[PDB]
Design a protein around this motif. Structure first.
Motif, PDB file in Angstrom:
ATOM      1  N   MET A  32      10.005  46.984  42.245  1.00 43.85           N
ATOM      2  CA  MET A  32      10.906  47.511  41.220  1.00 43.85           C
ATOM      3  C   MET A  32      12.287  47.863  41.760  1.00 43.85           C
ATOM      4  SD  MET A  32       9.178  47.131  38.370  1.00 43.85           S
ATOM      5  CE  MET A  32      10.506  47.777  37.367  1.00 43.85           C
ATOM      6  N   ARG A  33      12.346  48.414  42.943  1.00 48.32           N
ATOM      7  CA  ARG A  33      13.606  48.753  43.560  1.00 48.32           C
ATOM      8  C   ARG A  33      14.455  47.489  43.797  1.00 48.32           C
ATOM      9  NH1 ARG A  33      15.412  53.111  46.889  1.00 48.32           N
ATOM     10  NH2 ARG A  33      13.268  53.684  47.526  1.00 48.32           N
ATOM     11  N   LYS A  34      13.816  46.490  44.397  1.00 47.15           N
ATOM     12  CA  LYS A  34      14.457  45.167  44.525  1.00 47.15           C
ATOM     13  C   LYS A  34      14.968  44.578  43.216  1.00 47.15           C
ATOM     14  CE  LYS A  34      15.449  41.708  47.395  1.00 47.15           C
ATOM     15  NZ  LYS A  34      16.335  41.929  48.585  1.00 47.15           N
ATOM     16  N   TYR A  35      14.124  44.546  42.161  1.00 45.59           N
ATOM     17  CA  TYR A  35      14.492  44.113  40.889  1.00 45.59           C
ATOM     18  C   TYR A  35      15.704  44.872  40.338  1.00 45.59           C
ATOM     19  CZ  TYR A  35      13.398  42.473  36.089  1.00 45.59           C
ATOM     20  OH  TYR A  35      13.420  41.939  34.802  1.00 45.59           O
ATOM     21  N   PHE A  36      15.670  46.211  40.450  1.00 45.71           N
ATOM     22  CA  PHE A  36      16.761  47.039  39.973  1.00 45.71           C
ATOM     23  C   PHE A  36      18.100  46.732  40.713  1.00 45.71           C
ATOM     24  CE2 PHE A  36      19.467  50.864  40.708  1.00 45.71           C
ATOM     25  CZ  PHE A  36      20.000  50.940  39.473  1.00 45.71           C
ATOM     26  N   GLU A  37      18.035  46.629  42.033  1.00 46.95           N
ATOM     27  CA  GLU A  37      19.241  46.542  42.837  1.00 46.95           C
ATOM     28  C   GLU A  37      19.975  45.210  42.579  1.00 46.95           C
ATOM     29  OE1 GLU A  37      20.692  49.135  43.940  1.00 46.95           O
ATOM     30  OE2 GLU A  37      19.152  50.511  44.396  1.00 46.95           O
ATOM     31  N   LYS A  38      19.211  44.158  42.295  1.00 47.59           N
ATOM     32  CA  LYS A  38      19.805  42.891  41.929  1.00 47.59           C
ATOM     33  C   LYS A  38      20.501  42.978  40.577  1.00 47.59           C
ATOM     34  CE  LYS A  38      19.307  37.977  41.729  1.00 47.59           C
ATOM     35  NZ  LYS A  38      20.451  37.574  40.866  1.00 47.59           N
ATOM     36  N   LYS A  39      19.810  43.485  39.548  1.00 51.25           N
ATOM     37  CA  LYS A  39      20.423  43.683  38.255  1.00 51.25           C
ATOM     38  C   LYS A  39      21.678  44.533  38.330  1.00 51.25           C
ATOM     39  CE  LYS A  39      16.895  42.178  35.657  1.00 51.25           C
ATOM     40  NZ  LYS A  39      17.084  40.905  34.966  1.00 51.25           N
ATOM     41  N   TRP A  40      21.651  45.551  39.176  1.00 50.07           N
ATOM     42  CA  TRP A  40      22.763  46.482  39.328  1.00 50.07           C
ATOM     43  C   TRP A  40      24.020  45.731  39.902  1.00 50.07           C
ATOM     44  CZ3 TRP A  40      23.580  50.918  37.051  1.00 50.07           C
ATOM     45  CH2 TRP A  40      24.573  51.779  37.512  1.00 50.07           C
ATOM     46  N   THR A  41      23.844  45.041  41.008  1.00 45.25           N
ATOM     47  CA  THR A  41      24.868  44.250  41.664  1.00 45.25           C
ATOM     48  C   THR A  41      25.404  43.168  40.726  1.00 45.25           C
ATOM     49  OG1 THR A  41      23.992  44.642  43.822  1.00 45.25           O
ATOM     50  CG2 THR A  41      25.343  42.631  43.584  1.00 45.25           C
ATOM     51  N   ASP A  42      24.525  42.401  40.085  1.00 46.61           N
ATOM     52  CA  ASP A  42      24.953  41.353  39.196  1.00 46.61           C
ATOM     53  C   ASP A  42      25.682  41.865  37.991  1.00 46.61           C
ATOM     54  OD1 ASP A  42      23.698  39.703  40.935  1.00 46.61           O
ATOM     55  OD2 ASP A  42      22.100  39.088  39.517  1.00 46.61           O
ATOM     56  N   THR A  43      25.302  43.025  37.455  1.00 46.30           N
ATOM     57  CA  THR A  43      25.937  43.528  36.262  1.00 46.30           C
ATOM     58  C   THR A  43      27.297  44.202  36.557  1.00 46.30           C
ATOM     59  OG1 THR A  43      23.751  43.881  35.259  1.00 46.30           O
ATOM     60  CG2 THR A  43      25.613  45.141  34.366  1.00 46.30           C
ATOM     61  N   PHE A  44      27.427  44.886  37.690  1.00 50.72           N
ATOM     62  CA  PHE A  44      28.516  45.816  37.942  1.00 50.72           C
ATOM     63  C   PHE A  44      29.356  45.510  39.213  1.00 50.72           C
ATOM     64  CE2 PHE A  44      25.612  48.714  35.331  1.00 50.72           C
ATOM     65  CZ  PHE A  44      26.422  48.890  34.262  1.00 50.72           C
ATOM     66  N   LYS A  45      28.853  44.778  40.215  1.00 54.47           N
ATOM     67  CA  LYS A  45      29.599  44.517  41.488  1.00 54.47           C
ATOM     68  C   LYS A  45      30.134  43.070  41.601  1.00 54.47           C
TER      69      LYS A  45
END
Length: 115
Positions: free
Chosen positions: A102-115
């Motif tokens: 879940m952490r991996k899944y979250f961190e990818k979505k976070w980077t792709d959406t905002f970074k």
């Protein structure tokens, strides 16, 4: 500093986009350990050890009620969910593995959406 500002980043879609990320976390098949608060009456040790419990339903309620001042405070609660999980669960357990996934899944979505 006073009267000296960096250019204004558009933050008007952040609320909607954090809600979408959170929906995607809620519907992941490995989300089940994280959907509801840990039952502090039925899980020995949890209350004393985990100083700040957090779960997806609690994040959803905070989000929906304007309790996140900005997108970083939202990411801190999501990460808290996984940090708690690592504190209490062996890496080689179903819940321990769920947390890393879940952490991996979250961190990818976070980077792709905002970074």
């Amino acid at each position: 500093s006073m009267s000296v500002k960096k250019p204004k980043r558009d933050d008007s879609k952040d609320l909607a986009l954090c809600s979408m990320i959170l929906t995607e976390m809620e519907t992941h098949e490995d989300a089940w350990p994280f959907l509801l608060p840990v039952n502090l009456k039925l899980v020995p040790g949890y209350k004393k050890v985990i100083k700040k419990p957090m779960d997806f339903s609690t994040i959803r309620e905070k989000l929906s009620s304007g309790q996140y001042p900005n997108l970083e405070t939202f990411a801190l609660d999501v990460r808290l969910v996984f940090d708690n999980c690592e504190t209490f669960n062996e890496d080689d357990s179903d819940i321990g593995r769920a947390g890393h996934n879940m952490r991996k899944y979250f961190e990818k979505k976070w980077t792709d959406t905002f970074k």
